[PDB]
Amino acid sequence: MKRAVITGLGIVSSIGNNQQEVLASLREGRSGITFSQELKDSGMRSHVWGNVKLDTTGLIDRKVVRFMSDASIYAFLSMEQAIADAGLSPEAYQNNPRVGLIAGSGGGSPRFQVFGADAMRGPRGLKAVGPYVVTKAMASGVSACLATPFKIHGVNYSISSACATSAHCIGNAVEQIQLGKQDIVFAGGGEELCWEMACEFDAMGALSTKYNDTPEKASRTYDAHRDGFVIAGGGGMVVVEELEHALARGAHIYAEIVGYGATSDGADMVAPSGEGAVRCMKMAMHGVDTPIDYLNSHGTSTPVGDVKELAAIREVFGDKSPAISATKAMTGHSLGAAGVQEAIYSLLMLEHGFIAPSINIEELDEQAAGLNIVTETTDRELTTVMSNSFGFGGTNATLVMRKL
Amino acid sequence: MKRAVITGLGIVSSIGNNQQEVLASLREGRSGITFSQELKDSGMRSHVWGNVKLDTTGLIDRKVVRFMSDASIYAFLSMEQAIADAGLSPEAYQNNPRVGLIAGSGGGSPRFQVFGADAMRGPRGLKAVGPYVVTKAMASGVSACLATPFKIHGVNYSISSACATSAHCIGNAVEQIQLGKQDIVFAGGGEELCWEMACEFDAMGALSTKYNDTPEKASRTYDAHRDGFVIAGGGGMVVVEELEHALARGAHIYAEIVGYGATSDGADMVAPSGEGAVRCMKMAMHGVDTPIDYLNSHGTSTPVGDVKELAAIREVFGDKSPAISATKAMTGHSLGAAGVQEAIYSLLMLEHGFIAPSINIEELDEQAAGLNIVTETTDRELTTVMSNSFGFGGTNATLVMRKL
């Protein structure tokens, strides 16, 4: 069947506003985590976040931006970058039934939902709400707000699956290529960063609270004293393209997507089962005839989650486990954006031949022993990389990407 | 290529709490629309809705329902119905990697997004928010809250695309069967009904406001004096199953899904383009060697939307219009749940051999001439039926279903 490759990428993240900045951060092991007065003022216990350090004012046409929440803004900027990176002209990708968009968010916009409800409850009612809240607050905001301005004619929808959202978007893009239905699908996602949503995670005890005085040290996947994830926002987009189409136009090809796993735990709402993750990784590796050289773990800095994933990795790989690092120790957890951003970090590692460090491991967890968790930037000629995304609701995605 | 059939259905709708009540309403042309004191009290101009008339107290086990918003409640009940209808024992569908779930909502839970933020701002902060808000409020709530208790091991995620949400869910389930990845996928959706979300639509002028004194007349697709849609809630689920698998287990088969179109307008953010709909219908009809006997239109009762769709229908079918009716005139617009509910209405018409009326057309729109809009319940042997879902943000889905 038809083969899918990645021919362009774009990213707005806590560790950089484009792939050059991101690459520099990854090589330097630089944290994107800062203290948040907003989170503290809200009454949360977690006062740290992976914020986007970019003034987005004026970067998007008013007729376009008026419909957007922050998740859409970040995804739109990421898409602009990916189109430039891929070398695609509007003549080629616009008004083209074979060009689609699959991009989502984990939460939509709790900020604008709450804005709408607060405004409605005041003296001015509907007039205070205004006419733009639906496209800001609806679950499909990221796809809707981008398909119009980019003149997309093919598929147009959002997948959501919490922490796995943008990984399933990429996988679904691969399926569209495999089915012969699309030549190009822009795939990715975005997530806003706001107390309105973050407080929901703090309320379930999911966020780091013990390291607020040292924000760069809060996200610490695999460290014995990890205490929850650090919430983040941002966006990413990749250009998923059918192989012959890419070759015909002289595309720059980063990698082929040679595996896509998607499974379900059918067990616990918020904790991973392990069994689902093993099936997901094995599914992504089926027929892949090369070893995994580097695995970018889901690894959110949670007591239970981090080691559940490691146990699954041991079962999958037996006595030949890959180099591993958890880039969330640098970036935080961008929820709906995490899958595509982490696919991008993995692609940059593949393209530039290095492994980004798993930072903040002062004492390695006993359940991580004997694995090559890479803690210093390492130059290495990679060929095949794997990235895991294991979301709330027992939803699992794994992507395997390989040089062509 | 593998073929996909529907072997079970389940529904909680403004017109009935199961398929027997729905069939009776469809045949009778009975409105599901009532006056809402909730909407009026909130300060809205629209005071009518398509509510679910069912006390859900104690229908779902405490430990399962604690994670759920109303969208998930409705989808869950619909799934129970669909499972019984398909004759699937727990052993048949649970803990089975070949069995998946793709189900979504258009809005997630605005009610619980707002609840979280309100709770956080009160005297108990995180303790008032509690540990269940993420699963209620996140965009993937419907898939997450069902995959766990039904012990689903295959695919597990939500698609969101506004009014097209659960139609794309069904189409993606078909794709999973076509790719040979799953033998059964439960597909569908749910939507809560609440002022928190409804007020956003009223604020953009989308909802009917002139008929609050006569709620049953408010939703009036194709009528010259239509003035916007009537918001609704509910759920639906269908069992999408690979053909040979269905036959081998002695399943009852309603219909084969013989076409699925998904396209994008890429045009004006606010209005349907018309051309996107044409492309979607044509995609769904590709290779289907029988005429479309009946078309369940998207038709929401909006001045612009209704006639845009009629124009697209004329372009596709010329002078050989199918029988058409807009069931939203009875049911209102259940947003994320509309695609699966309307596929179910269409399947019931196909199974029982009748065409449900397009009600409330007192004066046919000056731009609706030369088509067959059916306004009275009509018994007729049907073979091939089509259902359109054209979502906000220019996202289109069409399903074509045919007797085996």
UniProtKB/Swiss-Prot annotation, chains A, B:
Its EC number is 2.3.1.41. It comes from the Bacteria. Induction: Mainly activated by FadR, but minor repression is also conferred by FabR. One of its GO terms (cellular component) is cytosol. One of its GO terms (molecular function) is 3-oxoacyl-[acyl-carrier-protein] synthase activity. It is an enzyme of class 2 (transferase). Homodimer. This is 3-oxoacyl-[acyl-carrier-protein] synthase 1. The lineage of its organism: Bacteria, Pseudomonadati, Pseudomonadota, Gammaproteobacteria, Enterobacterales.
